[PDB]
Design a protein around this ligand. Sequence first.
Ligand SMILES: Cc1cc(C(=O)Nc2ccc(O)c(-c3cc(C(=O)O)ccn3)c2)no1
Ligand SMILES: [Mn+2]
Ligand SMILES: [Zn+2]
Length: 350
Amino acid sequence: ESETLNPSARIMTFYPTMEEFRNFSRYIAYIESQGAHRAGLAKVVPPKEWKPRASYDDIDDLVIPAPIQQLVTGQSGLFTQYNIQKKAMTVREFRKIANSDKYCTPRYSEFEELERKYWKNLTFNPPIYGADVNGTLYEKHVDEWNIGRLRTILDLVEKESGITIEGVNTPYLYFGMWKTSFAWHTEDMDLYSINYLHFGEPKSWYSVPPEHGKRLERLAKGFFPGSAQSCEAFLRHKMTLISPLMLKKYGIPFDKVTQEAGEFMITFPYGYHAGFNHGFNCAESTNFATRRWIEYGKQAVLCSCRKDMVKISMDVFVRKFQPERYKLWKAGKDNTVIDHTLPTPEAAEF
Ligand SMILES: Cc1cc(C(=O)Nc2ccc(O)c(-c3cc(C(=O)O)ccn3)c2)no1
Ligand SMILES: [Mn+2]
Ligand SMILES: [Zn+2]
């Protein structure tokens, strides 16, 4: 049944009506009923009717406390990205650097050309990413798909423990410029994420189906044996860039999509993704959960080499949503096997 929906596991694109767009968790359940999760990544174009903010003219004063310069080293489609923290600057100052002759987008025709220049010049002229800025650009009254308050069961973490985790159950803003990158990764605790491109040049994405995630990890461990030996989940460092030609050379299934201003991207549990920005832009994102995520959370393989890494206690989720398995799980005897093709239980009504 689920196997027969999106059998190619390609990235799907949805055009919800305003009525479908009102209930967040419901529409996520719907696109899962259509097999969208199999790609690991889906695009959602909101109704033309909709807008999270009337104007972005008031934000050039917004502070980016920790701009990051992205040093990239490597060759032959394999790279490691090193972050050099720069001193705080305003959106105004960032935009100026971004559009400057030194850092601005190169001219090009088709997307494949711009993509080629990305992989050829990755290691040159390291750009600056205005990443991980705590905040939201949603107007306080927007009640549809509000990244600040999506109301999924991820809310159980703060509700139960008072714990907030920046960018995970709070919103992050990302100011891009040409050739700024996000490395191959799944989300913390293998959660969902939502990404909204407020304004500016596009953001291009690569994705690998969850059902082939393990194959990507095996490749990554082979190419980086030192890193694999020091950490049980070194891709969570988010420093590892791998070109689509390299994935193609080693038989890893993957898809590409380009995100335009005003569009949503949804990543799904255990969905590996990576990509880059085309030029000056701004994105807002956070994580979220569904009932399906819980098993993923229970089995997520975490970074073993850093204290300050993100770790959510699964206990409250197993008690409340899997009470019959709690004893078994707590005694380490819960051998549930994840089927990456099945849609979340909330999808029943479709
Ligand atoms: C140092 C340091 C920290 C990070 C990081 O946490 N990055 C991160 C953490 C979680 C994510 O989901 C994404 C991410 C970022 C984007 C994007 O930048 O557009 C798109 C998709 N995923 C990126 N990268 O370098
Ligand atoms: Mn991500
Ligand atoms: Zn680690």
